[PDB]
Paper text:
BipA (TypA or YihK) is a member of the translational GTPase protein family, to which translational factors EF-G,2 EF-Tu, and IF2 also belong. The translational GTPase BipA regulates the expression of virulence and pathogenicity factors in several eubacteria. Full-length BipA can be subdivided into five domains. Beginning from the N terminus, the first four domains are homologous to domains I, II, III, and V of EF-G, whereas the last domain at the C terminus is distinct and protein-specific.
Full-length protein of E. coli BipA crystallizes in the P21 space group with two copies in the asymmetric unit, but is monomeric in solution under physiologically relevant salt concentrations as demonstrated by gel filtration (data not shown). The structure was solved and refined to a resolution of 2.6 Å as described under “Experimental Procedures”. The x-ray crystal structure of the apo form of BipA consists of two superdomains. The N-terminal superdomain comprises domains I and II, and the C-terminal superdomain comprises domains III and V and the unique C-terminal domain. In BipA, these superdomains adopt a distinctive relative orientation to each other that has not been observed in any structure of the homologs EF-G or LepA. The unique C-terminal domain of BipA (residues 483–607) spatially occupies a position between domains III and V and consists of a unique mixed α + β fold composed of eight β-sheets and two α-helices. A long, polar region (residues 540–555) that extends from the distal end of the C-terminal domain is disordered in the crystal structure. We obtained crystals of full-length BipA only in the presence of [Co(NH3)6]3+, two of which can be localized within the structure. One cation is in the center of a crystal contact at the surface of domain I, whereas the other lies in the loop that connects domain V and the C-terminal domain. Apo BipA has a Guinier Rg of 31.06 Å and a real-space Rg of 33.18 Å with a maximum dimension (Dmax) of 108 Å.
Numbering used by the authors: 1 to 31, 56 to 539, 556 to 601
């Protein structure tokens, strides 16, 4: 007995009314979303733990997933599944969890449930076991009428089908009621009256107010403490209990400054629960102090220390990230999840008043069983049919393996690829122009595997490199556009070694733009990071983005050969 417990996490796009759904489940029971919603339906206790927004790689998602035994994916009957819920879903599958899928707003005009079922099932090649895609239940919902059913055209008179699906398909928590107390802190909270609050799912035993405990951290260091209050969850609120047991998701109040991954134990049996979120980076990138003639002329913060400090500050609220020191004490090896991750770190360092230069992002190879290996991704593209042949060939050049293609029937088409990150880096910029801006691209890390032999097509064109420092005059630029496209027009301030344009041919050319014009190519940070080669950097300031050679003088470059 006492396993009428169901702990489930809920996933939804922010516009797909997960708040409205839970609210309906709440008011038809015997009981921004609360972080936990405790529902009493029949003799069952259903904990619905919320998931963070689509942008939150602090490890919060896998903290939630470590407390629940299933997941509830809510999907609009017209929009279908949204790309933003991709990563939360991939992590639920990573924790072995099976999904319950709810297709709500099934009564809205233009609803197409059969269609979104296929989408949800197809989105489900986030490499999910047949256990997770075969036999996931589908429950259609209309929050307006508060009705659910296994068939949208044959719905029940209330939400009973959704309750039953949860009871039937969510397993009871894998816990022991009889052992000594053991609970890992998965979430933290705070209140001015009660202090630091530790939230988790009790793995073993039971806890009472004033119970003597021992907290062991991730390392093995311990301290004794006394439980203040034991807050069980009821509805959207918390309330003091005299007793919480194994399987319960509760909050404990008097243990001091708890940390995530701390394990609260009975003093007689101190045993730490294993930590979780090993989310390793797959793409590295050099963050360097700006050593250019414009150093510290647009950015306030430029020394090596404010760099190393700010980087070692994103570490607390980002764990996919790594930061290393290099032999060069003016450069740092920053590694993140994808190329997009490191971009936003820079893009809002720019807004902090930071001035720095960065290298082209490369993949992190990893040796496994004597075999060198690289990361692969699952890529899904949506292009107009007039771009299909062009997009395909490009991905083939970038070591892409076509796994599926599926036409809209209305002009567009979806393509599915397995591709190494090595070949997908910088593709986004090319793709968007190549597709004339219509195309959509979404990537998801798949697995490491043996490296595909060969290289990705290098930049075909060389660059135009400024030979001196000063303001660019139009009399020179008109002569330079005879040899390629420029990055700047009249009177732009320029120094030596700065890349000022794209050569119409393959070799680099050192020219003079200091000695009536086509609009200059202006590049976003994303475009600039795609452009540069291995002997180049992207100079980044709060208000500017310049591209420069690693070696500024033409003599230094030629010497490197």
């Amino acid at each position: 007995m006492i396993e009428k417990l169901r702990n489930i996490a809920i996933i939804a796009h922010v516009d797909h009314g997960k708040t409205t759904l839970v609210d309906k489940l709440l008011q038809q029971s015997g009981t921004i979303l609360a972080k936990n919603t405790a529902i009493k339906w029949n003799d069952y206790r259903i904990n619905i733990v919320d998931t963070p927004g689509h942008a939150d790689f602090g490890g919060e998602v896998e903290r939630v997933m470590s407390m629940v035994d299933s997941v509830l994916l809510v999907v609009d009957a017209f929009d279908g599944p949204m790309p933003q819920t991709r990563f939360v879903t991939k992590k639920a599958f990573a924790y072995g969890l099976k999904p319950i899928v709810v297709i709500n707003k099934v009564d809205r005009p233009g609803a197409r449930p059969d269609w979104v079922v296929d989408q949800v099932f197809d989105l489900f090649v986030n490499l999910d076991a047949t256990d997770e895609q075969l036999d996931f239940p589908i429950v259609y919902a209309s929050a307006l009428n508060g009705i659910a059913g296994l068939d949208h055209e044959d719905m029940a008179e209330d939400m009973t089908p959704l309750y039953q699906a949860i009871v039937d398909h969510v397993p009871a928590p894998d816990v022991d009621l009889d052992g000594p107390f053991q609970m890992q802190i998965s979430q933290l909270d705070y209140n001015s009256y009660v202090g630091v609050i530790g939230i988790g799912r009790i793995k073993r035993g039971k806890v009472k107010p004033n119970q003597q405990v021992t907290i062991i951290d991730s390392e093995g260091k311990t301290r004794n403490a006394k439980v203040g209050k034991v807050l069980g969850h009821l509805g959207l609120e918390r309330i003091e209990t005299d007793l919480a047991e194994a399987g319960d998701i509760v909050a404990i109040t008097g243990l001091g400054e708890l940390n995530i991954s701390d394990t609260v134990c009975d003093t007689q049996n101190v045993e730490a629960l294993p930590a979780l979120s090993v989310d390793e980076p797959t793409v590295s990138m050099f963050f360097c102090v700006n050593t250019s003639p414009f150093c510290g002329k647009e950015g306030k913060f430029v020394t090596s220390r404010q760099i190393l400090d700010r980087l070692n500050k994103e570490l607390v609220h980002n764990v996919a990230l790594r930061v290393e020191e290099t032999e060069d004490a003016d450069a740092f090896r920053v590694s993140g999840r994808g190329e997009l991750h490191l971009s936003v770190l820079i893009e809002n360092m720019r807004r902090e008043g930071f001035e720095l230069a960065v290298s082209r992002p490369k993949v992190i190879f990893r040796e496994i069983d004597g075999r060198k290996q690289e990361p692969y991704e699952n890529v899904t593209l949506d292009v107009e049919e007039q771009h299909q042949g062009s997009v395909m060939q490009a991905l083939g050049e970038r070591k892409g393996d076509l796994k599926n293609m599926n036409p809209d029937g209305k002009g567009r088409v979806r393509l599915d690829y397995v591709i190494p990150s090595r070949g997908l880096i910088g593709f986004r910029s090319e793709f968007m122009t190549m597709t004339s801006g219509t195309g959509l691209l979404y990537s998801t890390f798949s697995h490491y595997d043996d490296v595909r032999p060969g290289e990705v097509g290098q930049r075909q064109n060389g660059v135009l490199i400024s030979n001196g420092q000063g303001k660019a005059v139009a009399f020179a630029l008109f002569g330079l556009q005879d040899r390629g496209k420029l990055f700047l027009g009249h009177g732009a301030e320029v120094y030596e070694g700065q890349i000022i344009g794209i050569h119409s041919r393959s070799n680099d050319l050192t020219v003079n733009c200091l000695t009536v014009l086509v609009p200059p190519i202006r590049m976003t940070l994303e475009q600039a990071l795609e452009f540069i080669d291995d002997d180049e950097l992207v100079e980044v300031t709060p208000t500017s983005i310049r591209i420069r050679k690693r070696h500024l003088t033409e003599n230094d470059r030629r010497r490197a050969n």
